[PDB]
Amino acid sequence: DAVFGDRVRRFQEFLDTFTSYRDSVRSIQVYNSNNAANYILPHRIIISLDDLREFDRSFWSGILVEPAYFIPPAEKALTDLADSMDDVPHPWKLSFKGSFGAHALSPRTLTAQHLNKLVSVEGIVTKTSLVRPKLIRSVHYAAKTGRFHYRDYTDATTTLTTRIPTPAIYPTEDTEGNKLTTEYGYSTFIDHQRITVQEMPEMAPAGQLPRSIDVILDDDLVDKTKPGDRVNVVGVFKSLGAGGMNQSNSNTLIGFKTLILGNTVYPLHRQMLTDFDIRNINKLSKKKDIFDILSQSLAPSIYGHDHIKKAILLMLMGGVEKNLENGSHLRGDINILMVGDPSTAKSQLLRFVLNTASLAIATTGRGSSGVGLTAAVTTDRETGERRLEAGAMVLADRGVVCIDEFDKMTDVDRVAIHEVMEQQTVTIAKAGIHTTLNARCSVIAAANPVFGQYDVNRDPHQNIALPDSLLSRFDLLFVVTDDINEIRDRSISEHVLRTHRVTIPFLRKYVQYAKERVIPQLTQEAINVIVKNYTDLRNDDNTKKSPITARTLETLIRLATAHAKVRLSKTVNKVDAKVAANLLRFALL
Amino acid sequence: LPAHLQQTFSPEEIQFIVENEPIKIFPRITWQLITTDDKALNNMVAMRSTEVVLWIALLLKQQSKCSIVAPQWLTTKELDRKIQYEKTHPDRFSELPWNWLVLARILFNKAKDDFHDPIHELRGKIQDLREIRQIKVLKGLKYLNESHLQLDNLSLLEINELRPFITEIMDKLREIHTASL
Amino acid sequence: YYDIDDVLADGTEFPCKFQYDIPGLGYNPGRPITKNTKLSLPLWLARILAIVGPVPFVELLPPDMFSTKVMNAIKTDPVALDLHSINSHFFSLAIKWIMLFSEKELANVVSELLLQRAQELNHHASSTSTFLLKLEEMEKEIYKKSHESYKDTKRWMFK
Amino acid sequence: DDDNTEIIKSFKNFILEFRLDSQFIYRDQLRNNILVKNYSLTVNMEHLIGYNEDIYKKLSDEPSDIIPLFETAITQVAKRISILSRNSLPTFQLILNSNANQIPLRDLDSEHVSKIVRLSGIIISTSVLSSRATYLSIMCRNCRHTTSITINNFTVSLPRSCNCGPDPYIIIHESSKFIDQQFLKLQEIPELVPVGEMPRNLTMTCDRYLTNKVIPGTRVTIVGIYSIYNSKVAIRTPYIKILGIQSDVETSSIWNSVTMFTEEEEEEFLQLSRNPKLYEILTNSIAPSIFGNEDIKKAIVCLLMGGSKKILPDGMRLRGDINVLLLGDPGTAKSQLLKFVEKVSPIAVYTSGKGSSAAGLTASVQRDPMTREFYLEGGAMVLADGGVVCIDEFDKMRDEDRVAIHEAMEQQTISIAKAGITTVLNSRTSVLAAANPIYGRYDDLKSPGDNIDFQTTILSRFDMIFIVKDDHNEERDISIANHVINIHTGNANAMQNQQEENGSEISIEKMKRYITYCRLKCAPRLSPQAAEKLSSNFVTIRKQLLINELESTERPITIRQLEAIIRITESLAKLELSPIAQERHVDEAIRLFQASTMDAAS
Amino acid sequence: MYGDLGNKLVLEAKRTKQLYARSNQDVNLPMYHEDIIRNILKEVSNLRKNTEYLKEQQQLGMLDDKVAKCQYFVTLLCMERNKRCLLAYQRLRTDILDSMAWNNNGLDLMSSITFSQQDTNNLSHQEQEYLKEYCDLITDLKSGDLVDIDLSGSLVPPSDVFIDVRVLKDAGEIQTEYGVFNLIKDSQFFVRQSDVERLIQQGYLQKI
DNA sequence: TTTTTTTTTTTTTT
Ligand SMILES: Nc1ncnc2c1ncn2[C@@H]1O[C@H](COP(=O)(O)OP(=O)(O)NP(=O)(O)O)[C@@H](O)[C@H]1O
Ligand SMILES: Nc1ncnc2c1ncn2[C@@H]1O[C@H](COP(=O)(O)OP(=O)(O)NP(=O)(O)O)[C@@H](O)[C@H]1O
């Protein structure tokens, strides 16, 4: 393998020329020892492939083409270099970027030639085969002859190059027959995983279904990504396994299940605000009509319903949280529902909450099993371990669940749905594992009138379609009438017609920032009013309609707090409460 | 306004070009004709080698009062020496009569009877000849740059059929390149 | 000019901020727009807006299609990238920006783009699949004259 | 093998020598396809039988032992064609088709096994791409001897010769070459020969340039070879390896798609647009069977073209094209009509369910009981995406995903959060509702609403809703009753339509290619004022149905109804192949839904 | 919002270039857009209306403001823009029609452009007058030669020399010139290239 | 030289 060293001395020139990589190299080499001065760093480096055409194109192409012959000596080169660095006081890894490609492709298609080559391939993460650590290097200590003894085990999944079947036994008393004890806490174990990726369902060509394919995640790549996330996954596509021709079994056509090793795994759509941007965020934040402004831009086509819009943004903040000490939490995230005659744009309105909201996942009615319930993947998958897997609502943790036809979901689902909102967790007894896992989620749905257009005529009782405690947990019930005004109908027409014929993306960039910086806490000014308001409700709102509870007031907290994040005020203020007093009026009238 | 083609010549036309070239024939016949570009002749000796223009020979062969000679370049054993030269010279296109592809179709259409065993032979040899020559063309096409072109030996049919592609492209090349300054 | 593509080529907006205040807004009620207000503008007007001011009326930030992103994107595997997706008027355009702004490197790159493209484009001389969709308009027409040349040629070749 | 090498020479001969006057078709085809990177050639077995009978007589005898040889020469042929030497050049594929002679599936047993069989059937479901070996090499686990196997087709375990033993070899995975394999599951044609029983499905397998050539659920023709393999007495599984496959007419279509072009189409499609009768002659394409019912008859057309689908940012997108109701008294012809409609669609699924025939009307994800792990099983709506929706018995549809119909028609999607998978998958499918109304004509003296299940909202979900009322009335019958006995024997009305073919009428297998054609060009759109006209028309439709409701009548109208009538405009316009739509153009779409407004008034 | 309106038109010019380009060639230009150019024209007259107004305004309170200096260097550009669009639209619209002239008249005995170029009414009258005036001009090229040409005829090279043409539902005979060949439905011949050229373009003759 | 597997989805049913 003289050429193996040739790839290295070719790339050795690339070491220090250009040296723009050595900065982060050294940086790892420093922040590790700075954590060593504490009182965690991964070893691997992003390399934009873009630069490499500026040295050897002849080396460039093969990096994608036959990485088994190229990437391991340059891999060795990272380690070689970094070892030449200070200071005395590990195999490393790589990623790259792209800057692609041939080799630009989506998971929907692959092979023949596409195999055995570096590729970037993007998409949905499912089903997340769960983590187990893996054996690589063996080590043992002889006595009384002493010394230190070892082996190095190599799976077909490790590295790239084909190698003799190392596995699987401890060397165990190498000659002369001296006892050899496992070196545990010495010998190397890198964690391993296999994660399939489904191509985006909407970009599917035809009635043909989505096809996922697995990608092995070694070292860091594990725990980086949960299921359901959009991820560009890069690495080299291995031809793996016997062709059924290893043995007499089986006499058949089928064979060669295969996946991709390495490499990078970037998430896609967080975010990156620099300075110049957030300066705009705050420049706008100063303006006092901006709440309404942000509300209007939500629905480019849709008419008005600005009170509903506001309500949505109020859910888009999260309305902070407060966790008790040694007691149960006070839910701060906001749960609402839409109701009204068909063609209210309720479903389509949900589809706006599909993209800007930074998750979570929406569902049409069904739904289940238990939605966010894991429903206990069974049996095992794999190696004799019964496993759970992310359910809808779980995947939706700290995100937006949305529902088309929450009225059409089963009565049996509703049980765990109560468990979704008050208890705000997930209880699992099924086989099984008894874990109570956090279900804390922002949840909005829509329901149609139980019977026809009578949504307006009939009392809310019987118009519910989903009694009862379901109604309590809802911060708002929104009745939207299809009722006719020809005066309005002209307006209804023209904007709808100019349809087919204040910026939202920035709205996401702003909302995200308003979450973490900052939480408002509270001031007594809102308190000096909304109390008067609540009792005012109870002594009045019962002479009109129902219901009224303490909970509906707790929403005054959440609502006010939501707009409090909208003002980006470091604290809650009275006028925010006035925004709440606004929203609940139109909630019941 | 010709519209079509327009810069390049139609193969249909270029055949009209080559049809104006001189060749030998074997007359059946023993006024004048006067014509224009003909000169010759007085009543032309029957069953003897004689030089005329192609298209006249085409027409009198259509009356079969003449017989067209196979060009001495066109033969099996000859095509072999040339195509062999072609394989052992990956860059140069060797040497050809230059109106030939047209001549081939032209003669095979009518003059077919005069040759000895052109059938199922030459059409293959020239198909292959045109083949290795065609790949020599296409492979030469990566050196394409402004402003220089050596096509050296290439036939007018060969060339004209591909004319628009190098011409039109090369302009997009040179224009932008000198435009840089 | 009198090829539709010439008036059509300037139909592309380029990022440009003005170096001056411009009373009499070209678009609505400024009426002036303050210096360094970012705007996408058609090349036909913009082209001269640099030539006259000796400081110009307009700053002219680099276009989104000439980004290092795309410029090396083409450098990776020229055949695969879809030119129709980018503008689609590019060689009909990039020529104009490389004239107006007078760059020297990207040229030597771009020419090679068209080269490789044509290396492939000739290979379609013989009588698509996914490819035929993704070509630029001039890249689409070169195909016309080239192909149709052959398309007549073979029909002559036999009867 | 030098015998096989003489056969090799025989095929090299076959290619270089062969002539159709005068170009050598396969020879041209090669250098044509090498720049396509097709690396394959489709050869008529008749030019072969015309070239030398002998080689076929032995080819037809054990083709399996020869077909690769046939390739080993033509892969060499490219060597003497593609380039000159003194890379890497992939081993060729060959695809051979022939007119041949058709054989029915039910009669396929033993006998013809290990030979060529032309036959059609229809594919049910596509297997996932499965890659297979082409070249592989191996070092020994013990002696480190370097072996090189060319894996060829058409099992065969790895050879053990340089303890060393028993078989010490493991694949060099790094250096190996590869190909895809499809594993077609395909079904016999619906018509023959079921006798009494259920349709069989016999499994076949594509590879290389054959893969993904055929959609799930489309009529197709495969030639291939009848063979067997164990696959856990001797009881080995029947199958057919695939060469070559050809689509039944066309089918081409997929993807993006095809023309190609055969120029006469554009002209002939434009002349259609210059024919003032074209809209109406399409109407006369739809029912050679059905004389009359011209209203709904005009209503079918506008759906198939696809209507307005406009995606405007943000992710908001409005559907196309729409929905239609055939509900009316039996005698409507609407099932006969629908059985025209589905055959018209380039790609669609006919559902009388419940869901069709055995289909979960929506895709129902079902665990593979082997190796666990739920996988989505597909669905009628799913497979029918970008195609027609056929529904009978809509009185009886599955109530739970009835809502997934209540949704997929609109949001162009179905969300499955069930089990593991959250993917919201596309049904852009356009529904036509053919169900029979409750009690026939008895809902006419009643409230015509709530006719469909327990809610009126389904109507809103639909668009072009049409109530077909046939009274026993005079002379409109006596002419269609006259039409009848002609229709039956001797097709005295089906001859009368063939002189209208020469005079006027469309061929309707054409109509497929028409609607395939103009659905792939970008979406048509109305000029502003026809829209404002939709505004003053509808302000009075809505005004009228509040005033109609001055009687406190329960009901019907929405704002998706106006928009519904919008999409009909771009439909009827997409007929025209015109980016715009004229005022009156839109107007007969108005008169076209106007009957449904009186369906609201009745 | 400004010089854009013409871009719709030049786009249409693209498509109508495509309607002659392959095409296959039936010509038949869709229409002169009389409405839209006039929209442009009301803005092109509006532009120099604004500019003439500013030419008044520059003289009073603007005082040759460096920005006031701009809009002459600015709006006038859109004047050139429109001009470009309109010009090239019409140079297209004409080059196509002059081509439609050259090919056929058409040919004997043209004997008239009447019913030829079926557009007739649909083609705008300024172009109608122009075109017919232009083939009036081309008749003078029939005057200049004195070949005889038959520029309109004899486009493709001769061969050889005799062909078999079949008549399609055509009578006939108009054959008074030369000699009378008696045109009947389903009538073919064996005849020299010469006489072919006219009734082959006249549509009467067919097979070559 | 062999290893090892019961929920979840849907269904037809009193
Ligand atoms: N501003 C708007 N207001 C109302 N509807 C609109 C508006 N703009 C568009 N629409 C359309 O109105 C329809 C709304 O349907 P929608 O109610 O959201 O679905 P749905 O509720 O699931 N059907 P249903 O369950 O019966 O209520 C869609 O076709 C939208 O495209
Ligand atoms: N133009 C026509 N109009 C009416 N009936 C026709 C026509 N042509 C044929 N028929 C005959 O009448 C029947 C028309 O179908 P029809 O009686 O309406 O049943 P259907 O409603 O389509 N089926 P279903 O959807 O379950 O109600 C056919 O069975 C034909 O025999």
PDB file of N, CA, C and O and ligand atoms in Angstrom, chain D residues 289-291 330-336 392 434 436 480, ligand 2:
ATOM      1  N   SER D 289     -71.845   5.289 -25.496  1.00  0.00           N
ATOM      2  CA  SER D 289     -72.888   4.577 -24.780  1.00  0.00           C
ATOM      3  C   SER D 289     -74.085   5.467 -24.471  1.00  0.00           C
ATOM      4  O   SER D 289     -75.211   5.180 -24.881  1.00  0.00           O
ATOM      5  N   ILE D 290     -73.828   6.559 -23.753  1.00  0.00           N
ATOM      6  CA  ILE D 290     -74.906   7.368 -23.202  1.00  0.00           C
ATOM      7  C   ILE D 290     -75.331   8.483 -24.141  1.00  0.00           C
ATOM      8  O   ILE D 290     -74.576   9.415 -24.419  1.00  0.00           O
ATOM      9  N   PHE D 291     -76.562   8.369 -24.626  1.00  0.00           N
ATOM     10  CA  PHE D 291     -77.191   9.423 -25.402  1.00  0.00           C
ATOM     11  C   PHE D 291     -78.014  10.271 -24.445  1.00  0.00           C
ATOM     12  O   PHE D 291     -78.938   9.776 -23.798  1.00  0.00           O
ATOM     13  N   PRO D 330     -81.463   5.382  -9.934  1.00  0.00           N
ATOM     14  CA  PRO D 330     -80.921   4.324 -10.792  1.00  0.00           C
ATOM     15  C   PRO D 330     -81.525   4.433 -12.180  1.00  0.00           C
ATOM     16  O   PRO D 330     -82.730   4.658 -12.285  1.00  0.00           O
ATOM     17  N   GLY D 331     -80.713   4.276 -13.219  1.00  0.00           N
ATOM     18  CA  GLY D 331     -81.131   4.632 -14.564  1.00  0.00           C
ATOM     19  C   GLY D 331     -80.422   5.884 -15.024  1.00  0.00           C
ATOM     20  O   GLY D 331     -80.685   6.419 -16.102  1.00  0.00           O
ATOM     21  N   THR D 332     -79.539   6.371 -14.163  1.00  0.00           N
ATOM     22  CA  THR D 332     -78.773   7.578 -14.429  1.00  0.00           C
ATOM     23  C   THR D 332     -77.671   7.355 -15.468  1.00  0.00           C
ATOM     24  O   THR D 332     -77.242   8.304 -16.132  1.00  0.00           O
ATOM     25  N   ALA D 333     -77.243   6.093 -15.589  1.00  0.00           N
ATOM     26  CA  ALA D 333     -76.112   5.638 -16.417  1.00  0.00           C
ATOM     27  C   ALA D 333     -74.784   5.930 -15.735  1.00  0.00           C
ATOM     28  O   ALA D 333     -73.721   5.570 -16.231  1.00  0.00           O
ATOM     29  N   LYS D 334     -74.871   6.561 -14.574  1.00  0.00           N
ATOM     30  CA  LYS D 334     -73.712   7.025 -13.831  1.00  0.00           C
ATOM     31  C   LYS D 334     -72.675   5.952 -13.462  1.00  0.00           C
ATOM     32  O   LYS D 334     -71.506   6.281 -13.294  1.00  0.00           O
ATOM     33  N   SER D 335     -73.073   4.690 -13.299  1.00  0.00           N
ATOM     34  CA  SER D 335     -72.057   3.647 -13.103  1.00  0.00           C
ATOM     35  C   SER D 335     -71.467   3.241 -14.434  1.00  0.00           C
ATOM     36  O   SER D 335     -70.263   3.023 -14.544  1.00  0.00           O
ATOM     37  N   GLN D 336     -72.325   3.118 -15.437  1.00  0.00           N
ATOM     38  CA  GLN D 336     -71.865   2.897 -16.794  1.00  0.00           C
ATOM     39  C   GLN D 336     -70.993   4.081 -17.200  1.00  0.00           C
ATOM     40  O   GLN D 336     -69.910   3.912 -17.775  1.00  0.00           O
ATOM     41  N   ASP D 392     -68.358   4.518  -6.091  1.00  0.00           N
ATOM     42  CA  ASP D 392     -69.759   4.110  -5.965  1.00  0.00           C
ATOM     43  C   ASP D 392     -70.058   3.914  -4.496  1.00  0.00           C
ATOM     44  O   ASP D 392     -69.158   4.039  -3.666  1.00  0.00           O
ATOM     45  N   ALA D 434     -70.351   9.152  -7.162  1.00  0.00           N
ATOM     46  CA  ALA D 434     -71.435   8.497  -7.894  1.00  0.00           C
ATOM     47  C   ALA D 434     -72.547   7.848  -7.053  1.00  0.00           C
ATOM     48  O   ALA D 434     -73.401   7.165  -7.618  1.00  0.00           O
ATOM     49  N   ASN D 436     -75.709   6.449  -4.829  1.00  0.00           N
ATOM     50  CA  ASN D 436     -77.152   6.550  -4.952  1.00  0.00           C
ATOM     51  C   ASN D 436     -77.783   7.219  -3.734  1.00  0.00           C
ATOM     52  O   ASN D 436     -77.570   6.782  -2.602  1.00  0.00           O
ATOM     53  N   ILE D 480     -83.953   7.886 -27.293  1.00  0.00           N
ATOM     54  CA  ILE D 480     -82.849   7.140 -26.653  1.00  0.00           C
ATOM     55  C   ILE D 480     -83.194   5.650 -26.568  1.00  0.00           C
ATOM     56  O   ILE D 480     -82.325   4.788 -26.579  1.00  0.00           O
TER      57      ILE D 480
HETATM   58  N1  LIG G   2     -77.734   6.753 -22.107  1.00  0.00           N
HETATM   59  C1  LIG G   2     -78.288   5.914 -21.233  1.00  0.00           C
HETATM   60  N2  LIG G   2     -79.137   6.409 -20.301  1.00  0.00           N
HETATM   61  C2  LIG G   2     -79.695   5.571 -19.427  1.00  0.00           C
HETATM   62  N3  LIG G   2     -79.545   4.249 -19.321  1.00  0.00           N
HETATM   63  C3  LIG G   2     -78.701   3.784 -20.254  1.00  0.00           C
HETATM   64  C4  LIG G   2     -78.052   4.519 -21.216  1.00  0.00           C
HETATM   65  N4  LIG G   2     -77.252   3.709 -22.019  1.00  0.00           N
HETATM   66  C5  LIG G   2     -77.451   2.508 -21.512  1.00  0.00           C
HETATM   67  N5  LIG G   2     -78.301   2.470 -20.438  1.00  0.00           N
HETATM   68  C6  LIG G   2     -78.715   1.281 -19.704  1.00  0.00           C
HETATM   69  O1  LIG G   2     -79.261   1.660 -18.463  1.00  0.00           O
HETATM   70  C7  LIG G   2     -78.286   1.448 -17.420  1.00  0.00           C
HETATM   71  C8  LIG G   2     -77.722   2.772 -16.991  1.00  0.00           C
HETATM   72  O2  LIG G   2     -77.144   2.637 -15.666  1.00  0.00           O
HETATM   73  P1  LIG G   2     -78.036   2.835 -14.347  1.00  0.00           P
HETATM   74  O3  LIG G   2     -79.376   2.108 -14.438  1.00  0.00           O
HETATM   75  O4  LIG G   2     -78.174   4.289 -14.063  1.00  0.00           O
HETATM   76  O5  LIG G   2     -77.301   2.100 -13.152  1.00  0.00           O
HETATM   77  P2  LIG G   2     -76.302   2.947 -12.320  1.00  0.00           P
HETATM   78  O6  LIG G   2     -77.026   4.031 -11.584  1.00  0.00           O
HETATM   79  O7  LIG G   2     -75.315   3.589 -13.340  1.00  0.00           O
HETATM   80  N6  LIG G   2     -75.532   1.933 -11.232  1.00  0.00           N
HETATM   81  P3  LIG G   2     -75.588   2.595  -9.682  1.00  0.00           P
HETATM   82  O8  LIG G   2     -74.454   3.682  -9.579  1.00  0.00           O
HETATM   83  O9  LIG G   2     -75.344   1.538  -8.652  1.00  0.00           O
HETATM   84  O10 LIG G   2     -76.997   3.278  -9.454  1.00  0.00           O
HETATM   85  C9  LIG G   2     -77.266   0.438 -17.947  1.00  0.00           C
HETATM   86  O11 LIG G   2     -77.373  -0.786 -17.237  1.00  0.00           O
HETATM   87  C10 LIG G   2     -77.610   0.266 -19.439  1.00  0.00           C
HETATM   88  O12 LIG G   2     -78.092  -1.050 -19.701  1.00  0.00           O
END
